[PDB]
Structures are given as C-alpha cells and as structure tokens.
Design a binder for this molecule. Structure first.
Ligand SMILES: *CCCCC*
Length: 14
C-alpha cells in the first residue's frame, strides 16, 4: 500500500 496511513485513518474515525 501507499504506507500505513489509510488503515490508521480508518482506525481513527471508526
Ligand atoms: C480511508 C481513510 C479515511 C476514511 C474516513
């Protein structure tokens, strides 16, 4: 992926 960002952003919101 384009770094461990998308899943962190998901983790933050939800
Ligand atoms: C996909 C990361 C942002 C979701 C709110």
């Amino acid at each position: 992926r384009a770094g461990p960002l998308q899943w962190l952003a998901e983790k933050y919101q939800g």
